């Protein structure tokens, strides 16, 4: 029950704000900036095994997840340092899941 029934719309935005811009998660498509997310959840990173990962998430690498995304967007800083990604922590933790709820979506 850790993720509560929140809507992909409001995120979806936000994720073009700041993250389409660097993820294409488009499918089979190419890497741009960042890499490409597709089934991450539930998964460790390092699946792309094509595009190089910073030192931080390949040294510490973190089970990716509902519940470990909250936790990435929360505080992306000491929770993955050293890598060339900048997300500032949202304070409301509404909006934050509307943001995962946009990705998962694409997972299906
Ligand atoms: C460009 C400036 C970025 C924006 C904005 C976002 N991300 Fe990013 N992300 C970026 C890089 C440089 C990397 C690769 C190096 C690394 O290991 O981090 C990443 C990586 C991720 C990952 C982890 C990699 C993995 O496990 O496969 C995740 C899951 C991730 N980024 C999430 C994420 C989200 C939530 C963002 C928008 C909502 C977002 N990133 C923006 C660069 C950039």
């Known amino acids: 029950t850790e993720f509560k029934a929140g809507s992909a719309k409001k995120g ?3 994720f073009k704000t700041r993250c389409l811009q660097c993820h294409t998660v ?3 498509g190419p890497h741009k900036v960042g890499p490409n997310l597709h089934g991450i959840f539930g998964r460790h990173s390092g699946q ?3 595009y190089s990962y ?3 998430n390949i040294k510490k ?15 992306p800083a000491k929770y993955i340092p050293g ?3 900048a997300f500032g922590g949202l ?5 934050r899941n509307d943001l995962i709820t946009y990705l998962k ?4």
């Open 48 to 50: 792309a095994e094509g």
């Open 83 to 85: 890598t060339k990604m």
């Open 12 to 14: 979806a935005t936000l």
């Open 91 to 95: 304070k409301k933790e509404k909006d």
């Open 54 to 56: 910073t030192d931080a």
């Open 61 to 75: 690498n973190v089970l990716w997840d509902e519940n470990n995304m909250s936790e990435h967007l929360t505080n």
């Open 26 to 28: 488009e499918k089979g």
């Open 105 to 108: 979506k694409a997972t299906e």
